[PDB]
Design a protein around this ligand. Structure first.
Ligand code: PRO
Ligand SMILES: [Cl-]
Ligand SMILES: [Cl-]
Ligand SMILES: [Cl-]
Length: 129
């Protein structure tokens, strides 16, 4: 599913991401834009053989099981395919774990490089939230 901007903002808010670990909703929407272009089916192979899945490009080395990332963990206790669903619940639940891991949203390289310190409130402008 390719979410609309406000559509994703609303789903993220409903699932409790607005100000989760202190990060405003616009940060999460911005991260999703640059990680996946709001596409739940996005996948990207990493150099180490792991793969990133879903709207927030969650990695199989630590967070989900894809059956082809030797020595990996599955800290969110889910198949990586669950992160590609039109229902963002699994992605949100797992993202909450990631952002709590100590480095905040810096875990998302695209967020650090394209969102951090910018006017992220712009990402939810106009939305009926
Ligand atoms: O992420 C932000 O910018 C705001 C300020 C602290 C709580 N959320
Ligand atoms: Cl915001
Ligand atoms: Cl694996
Ligand atoms: Cl980047």
């Amino acid at each position: 599913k390719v979410f609309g901007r406000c559509e994703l903002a609303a789903a993220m808010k409903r699932h409790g991401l607005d100000n989760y670990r202190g990060y405003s909703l616009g940060n999460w929407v911005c991260a999703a834009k640059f990680e996946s272009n709001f596409n739940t089916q996005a996948t990207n192979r990493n150099t180490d053989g792991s793969t990133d899945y879903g709207i927030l490009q969650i990695n199989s080395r630590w967070w989900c099981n894809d059956g082809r990332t030797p020595g990996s963990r599955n800290l969110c206790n889910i198949p990586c395919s669950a992160l590609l669903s039109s229902d963002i619940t699994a992605s949100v639940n797992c993202a909450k774990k990631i952002v709590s891991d100590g480095n905040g949203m810096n875990a998302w390289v695209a967020w650090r490089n394209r969102c951090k310190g910018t006017d992220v409130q712009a990402w939810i402008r106009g939305c009926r939230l």
